[PDB]
Every structure is written in C-alpha cells, then in structure tokens.
Amino acid sequence: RDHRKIGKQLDLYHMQEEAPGMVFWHNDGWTIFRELEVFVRSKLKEYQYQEVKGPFMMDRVLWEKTGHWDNYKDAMFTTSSENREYCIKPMNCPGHVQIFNQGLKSYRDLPLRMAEFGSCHRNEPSGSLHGLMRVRGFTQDDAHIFCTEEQIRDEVNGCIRLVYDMYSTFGFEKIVVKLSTRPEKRIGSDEMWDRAEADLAVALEENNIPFEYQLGEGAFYGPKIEFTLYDCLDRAWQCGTVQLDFSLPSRLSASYVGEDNERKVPVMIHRAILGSMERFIGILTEEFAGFFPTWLAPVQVVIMNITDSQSEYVNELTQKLSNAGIRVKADLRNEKIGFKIREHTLRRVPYMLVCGDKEVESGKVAVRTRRGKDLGSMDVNEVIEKLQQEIRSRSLKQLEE
Amino acid sequence: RDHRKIGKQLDLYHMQEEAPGMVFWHNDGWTIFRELEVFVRSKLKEYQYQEVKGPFMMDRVLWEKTGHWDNYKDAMFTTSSENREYCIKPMNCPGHVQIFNQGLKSYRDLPLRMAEFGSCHRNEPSGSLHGLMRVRGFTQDDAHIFCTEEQIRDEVNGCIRLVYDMYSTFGFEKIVVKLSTRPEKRIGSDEMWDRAEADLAVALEENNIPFEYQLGEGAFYGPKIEFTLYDCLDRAWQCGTVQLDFSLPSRLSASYVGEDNERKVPVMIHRAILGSMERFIGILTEEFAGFFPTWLAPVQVVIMNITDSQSEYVNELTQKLSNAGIRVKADLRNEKIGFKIREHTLRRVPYMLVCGDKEVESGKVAVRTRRGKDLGSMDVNEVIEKLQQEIRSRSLKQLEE
Numbered sequence A, B: 001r002d003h004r005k006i007g008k009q010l011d012l013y014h015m016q017e018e019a020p021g022m023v024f025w026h027n028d029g030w031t032i033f034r035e036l037e038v039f040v041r042s043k044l045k046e047y048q049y050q051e052v053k054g055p056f057m058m059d060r061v062l063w064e065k066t067g068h069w070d071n072y073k074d075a076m077f078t079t080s081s082e083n084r085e086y087c088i089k090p091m092n093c094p095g096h097v098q099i100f101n102q103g104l105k106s107y108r109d110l111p112l113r114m115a116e117f118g119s120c121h122r123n124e125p126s127g128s129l130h131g132l133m134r135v136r137g138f139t140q141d142d143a144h145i146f147c148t149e150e151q152i153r154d155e156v157n158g159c160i161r162l163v164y165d166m167y168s169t170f171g172f173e174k175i176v177v178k179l180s181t182r183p184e185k186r187i188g189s190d191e192m193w194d195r196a197e198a199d200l201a202v203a204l205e206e207n208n209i210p211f212e213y214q215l216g217e218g219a220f221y222g223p224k225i226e227f228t229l230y231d232c233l234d235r236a237w238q239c240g241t242v243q244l245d246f247s248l249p250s251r252l253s254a255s256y257v258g259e260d261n262e263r264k265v266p267v268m269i270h271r272a273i274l275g276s277m278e279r280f281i282g283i284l285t286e287e288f289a290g291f292f293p294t295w296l297a298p299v300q301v302v303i304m305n306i307t308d309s310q311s312e313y314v315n316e317l318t319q320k321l322s323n324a325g326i327r328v329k330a331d332l333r334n335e336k337i338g339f340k341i342r343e344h345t346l347r348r349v350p351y352m353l354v355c356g357d358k359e360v361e362s363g364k365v366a367v368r369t370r371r372g373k374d375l376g377s378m379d380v381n382e383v384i385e386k387l388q389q390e391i392r393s394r395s396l397k398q399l400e401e
C-alpha cells in the first residue's frame, strides 16, 4: 500500500535527485494520467467549462499585484530575462484572469467557467517531499468561475455536484465537507460575506450534506468549502475546494458591464476537484493497491500463446483488440503459460487471453483475470464488447460478478 | 493572411508584455491545439511510440553533462532552490534518456520509441519574438528512437513515412528535403558516419524522394535530414527533422545488453514532424486563412433559432449533436437571424444550422456553410452522420466541396 513501491513495480514513474519533487512519467503511469485527463475533460464538457492554457511564467510585477510576492514569495521559483524578473507560476488563477480581461465582458457572458490542467511549481522544502504526494511540480484540475452575486449559489451547487460525481467514479462515497467562514479581519464587506457564506451553506443543504463549520478559518480574500474523501483504509484525503475570492478580480482589474449598463466587478470562484493530479494518482494507486479499474489500466489486456502455432492467431487478435480501442499487448515468448499468467497477474493486467490450438480452431479465447479467475472460453467479439462496456462506463469492477 | 490578426479575430490566443514569447491560449485556440494533439497521438499509436512526460526543470549538473551549458547557456532560464541551480528544459531529450536508463535494457527492447509533447522554454531575444512563430515557450512533437546500428535505416524509413503522412493530412504535398553530412571535426568514428549517412541517403532514395546534400552542415554530434513544407502561397516552412545523435547517450551513460551479452551503447534519433506546435498552428492559421477544416474548427456547428418559439427545439438538437461528438453551440440570443449568421460567418464556423417553425414541424434543420452555401433542409441524423464522416476522415473540404 505504498504508491512508490507499486509505482516502481508497475513501471509507472520515477524521480531523481537532479529534479527533486518532480516526476518523470514513464509510459504506463503517463497512460493513467492521460485517462484521468480524458475523464476530467468529459466532466468539463458536461458541466460546460472552457479549457484554456496559461503561460508557464509571468513578470514579477504581476505576482506583486496578485499578492503572491507578499504571501507566496518563498514558495516561488524566480528566473530572469533581459534584466526582468519572472516567476514560474505557483497558480493558474492570474493567467485565467488575464484571459478574462481580453475583450469587453457583459453580464450575458456570465457565468464564465474557465478550466485548465495547470502546471504549477512551488519551491517546497526538500525534506517535506514525499513521492507523488508532496511535490515541487504538479498539475491541478483547476478552474475559475466568473459570475454575478446572484449566480454564486447556483454555481456552488454545480461544483458540489461535480465533486460528488467525480469522487463517485473512483469509489469514494464517504465525504466530509467543511465550510470555513470569515476571519476577524478580511477583504470584502460584511454583507458580501453574509451572502457568500449563506450561499455555500444553502448549496450544501440543498444537496443534503451535513457539513462541518470551521469558524473564522476562511482566508482573508473569501469564505470556502473543502471536500475530504475517505479511502478503503478509512484515511482522510482533503482534495476538492470551492473558494470565493474578492481580492483577485479587483487587483487585476476584471470587470463586466451590468444589465443596468454600469461597471461591475465579477465574483470569482476557485474550484478544484482532484487537486494535484499526481497526488490523486498516488491516492488511487494505494486505494486500488495497484489494481486499476480497466479504464485506468496502462495495459488492459495481454494475449498469450502456448506454442507458436498460435502466434499468428494471437497477433491477429492483438491488432483487432487494438483497433477496437483497447490497450492490448501480445506475449509471444517461449516460457510456460503459467509463467506468463503469473507475470502479468503481478503486473495487474486486468485480462489475460490465452490461445491454444482449440481457441485458434474455434476462433475463441480463454479468458483469465488478474484476480485469479478463469472466465472460461469466450467469443472474441463478445470479449471486445464487454471490455468496451467496462471501459466506457469506467466500471470499478471486472467481468463475472 | 496574418495569423496574429486572424488569431485575434477568432479569439484563439493572446500575448502580453508580462509574459513575452509565451502564449495565453484561449478556449478556441486551445481546442485547435488539443485536436492537433489527438492527431499526433493517433500517429504515435499507429507508428508504435511510447508517450512519456519529463520534469520541467533539472539541475545544472545534468545540463552540463548533456553539453547544454557549453552550447546553450544564453538560451536557458535558470532558477534556484536550497543553493542548487536548475535549468528549465530547452529540450526533452535528456529526460527521455533518464527514463531510458531506468531498468536494465537488452536488444529485445530495441527499437524503443519514446515520444512526448515536450514543453520547452528558450530565452530568445525579445527583439526576435514574432507571434506564434518565434516564442519563448513552445511544445515540440518530440520523439527519440533508441536502436541498434542495424535498425537505423528501417527506423529512418519509418520517420520519413510519418512525415509525409502527417503533412499530407494538412494538405501540404510539396516537400523539400535536405541531407546534412559530416563537418570537419565530429563526435563518432568515420565508419559510424559512413553508415549513418548511407542509411539516411538510401532511406530517402527508396521512398523516391529527391533531396539535396548540405555538406559539412551536419551537427558535430550527427548527420541529419530536414523537411521543409510549402504552403498555398508557396512559402517555405522548415518543420520536420530526423537527427542522429552520437553524443547524448554516451554522455548520459545509456546502454543495453546485446545479443552477445556484451554492453552496447544505443544509437539515438531525435525526430520531430510538426516541430513547435504553436508555430505549426500559426502556419495552418495562415494556410487556411482562418477557415479551419471541420476537424480542426474550434466551433464546428452553430445552431440558431429565429424566435423564442424554436428555442426548446434548438436545445434538443444541440444536445444531440453534442452527444454525437460534434463541437456545437446554440445561439439563443435575442438578436435577428442575420446578426447571428454574420457573427458566426466571421468566426468561420463551418456549419450554421437554422431552425424556424418549419424546421420544428418537420424535424429537420436548415443547413448553410461559412462559404454561404445553402445546403437546405436536411434530416438531423443525415447531418450528424455526414459531419462525423467529415471529422473522422479529417477532410480538408466541406460538404459540397
């Protein structure tokens, strides 16, 4: 249940001292990451988020205006060009605001939801670095919603649904939500805060969620709610956040023309579901103990032969399965069949398709799983259909149950 | 045909002084980028490349080892943590080698093809920066092939085929190819260079490709092939390259077990087809004059209502086409039909569907293009099928073209 151990065993990634806290993603691990990306993008489509890409670094003046120079300075990597200082972005928010600021906005453009897979770098102390979980370089499932006050509640409700949606896909249904309210001194009026906090609380109660209050624990720039998922070992992972920000749009001069034809400053909401996607991959790796749901599995199927008499057939099948959109490898080496089955079982390949002479003759495949199950002889097209359903549904469970 | 002007007009991207030579990708431009990524990935699957992800920065010792400190010093951004100096990667190659070095390799693993969409930063002079074409931050369609000497030709052959495949998808059939051979002093033996040069030349000849020798223009580390496409204006763009490297693997201690069980150093091939993908997007933007082929179009279909009375209907179509994997938006605005048609025509939306009362009654859609071709009233499923065929084939031309 160490994601580093499992990571090494499955050849997912590795890290080096020449890049502390920075992941080298191998093919398989990167495949997992990319499937994560695909899922998130399906959610972005469904929930109507734009997807953008911000610049890797921006001028120091900008990060002064945002407040990062004051409150983020030690965490930021600085580099320079032509007598100008630049910070490598710890956060994607200012870039998103910069994109928002291009072109005149009106209320008709709101709510505006803007998402990115944001590459962030934070100069974390080397001694605090652990695996995929505490890192220097990472990617957030980051987004920002620009809306009217009147929209806030609805949008919050939208985020809440998204959270419980996404977590549910991974089999985390035990979730604790904490609402952090105003500190003694804050940006924004008492009224704005009453409205926002009430929006959060009501949004939660409409979803029937018994949230816990953290009183006075909100940031100076806004109130927030945070989502903590419990894994199979019942250990808590704080992942998702919905955070109101009154500081950012004002400092970056974001505005829109109201329905009353006057200048308004947009309400801004930071939202993330997974948080660091690397960290989330670690969490999943430990939750599943290396058995990834077939949709997330780097290699979904391994087709093997007894002798070379089946080699050809195997190859055929392989191409076929690859054409059907399945990640499939052929294992042709001369080794005993049990040998192959054991090796790929330890690699946590969801399905192993064995081809002997009878399979070739009958145009079938003998189906086995990493759980040690014999699924018996099966029609190839049937197998492809079932695998395609398992993947498309992102089912947590394999065949036969 | 200025890609910057069109870029602004289509809301693809923007750039600011606080991030010189670094792109803010808006939603539509990023949609284009991601589509390019999808294409490239289909290619990686077909031509059998791994896809990995390297760290964004590595310590200065590595970059000294590779030779970047000696030859690339002024072009590298540097930053520090805990009294250790790091370079933001100008190239993805060393990271790929670092990944290669994890686990024992034998001749059975060769050829090993490793690709990445590699985010690179180079500190170019500010005076040289132009649009998407000359930038500080870019992404290469980078790959490296680790092979034996005997494999070189074959692999080079694969690369050549890849190039001509990919270019032709975008409608570039006119390609000039240059072969650069040994300079007066170089890394690697006369025999190594004989063999590599012969491999390149014969590779080109067997594909029936006329080419020109640039003598002594090869890098000190290896001979190369370069690919220059010509656009519809007959302008030359150098994009693709296949580059032998005799330097990198020995400097980074890359090795594999040979058939003789003796330690061998693998041959390395840098290959890139598009080169900078930002630059390639500029190039395509100008080639198509902002009329992107349907598969590349950020918004493929806009569905408009004449009045409120069709709104519902429009929505329903919008979901349908959306579920069919089409990028579609609904224009429900309280504006005249001609207003909408004009805006979406200026946006170069390939297909404008109009729903009047007739259409709601008949279950059809009025179909017209950005070229101002009236395709008239068509059954929805027909339109869907046709659009899907146009997208899957990545067709250059629209319906009735």
Ligand SMILES: C[C@@H]1C[C@H](C)C[C@H](C)[C@@H](O)CC(=O)O[C@H]([C@@H]2CCC[C@H]2C(=O)O)C/C=C/C=C(\C#N)[C@H](O)[C@@H](C)C1
Residues within 6 Å of the ligand: A066, A067, A068, A069, A071, A072, A091, A093, A094, A219, A221, A241, A243, A245, A247, A248, A270, A271, A272
């Ligand atoms: C410069 C300030 C730093 C702040 C004081 C650091 C605190 C530790 C904490 O408040 C950060 C926080 O919760 O950020 C959280 C983010 C959201 C996802 C997880 C967390 C994440 O990314 O880590 C949200 C805020 C981003 C905020 C801004 C921006 N830009 C603010 O306008 C700006 C005033 C923040």
Ligand SMILES: C[C@@H]1C[C@H](C)C[C@H](C)[C@@H](O)CC(=O)O[C@H]([C@@H]2CCC[C@H]2C(=O)O)C/C=C/C=C(\C#N)[C@H](O)[C@@H](C)C1
Residues within 6 Å of the ligand: B066, B067, B068, B069, B071, B072, B091, B093, B094, B219, B221, B241, B243, B245, B247, B248, B270, B271, B272
């Ligand atoms: C540190 C050295 C820099 C080199 C001398 C700079 C020259 C201007 C030129 O030779 C670069 C070049 O052709 O790189 C090209 C790349 C390929 C695609 C476009 C070009 C690209 O990325 O621009 C290939 C070489 C990468 C090389 C290495 C690495 N690592 C070498 O082992 C190392 C010795 C290179």
Ligand SMILES: [Zn+2]
Residues within 6 Å of the ligand: A091, A092, A093, A142, A143, A144, A270, A271
């Ligand atoms: Zn943010």
Ligand SMILES: [Zn+2]
Residues within 6 Å of the ligand: B091, B092, B093, B094, B142, B144, B270
């Ligand atoms: Zn390279």
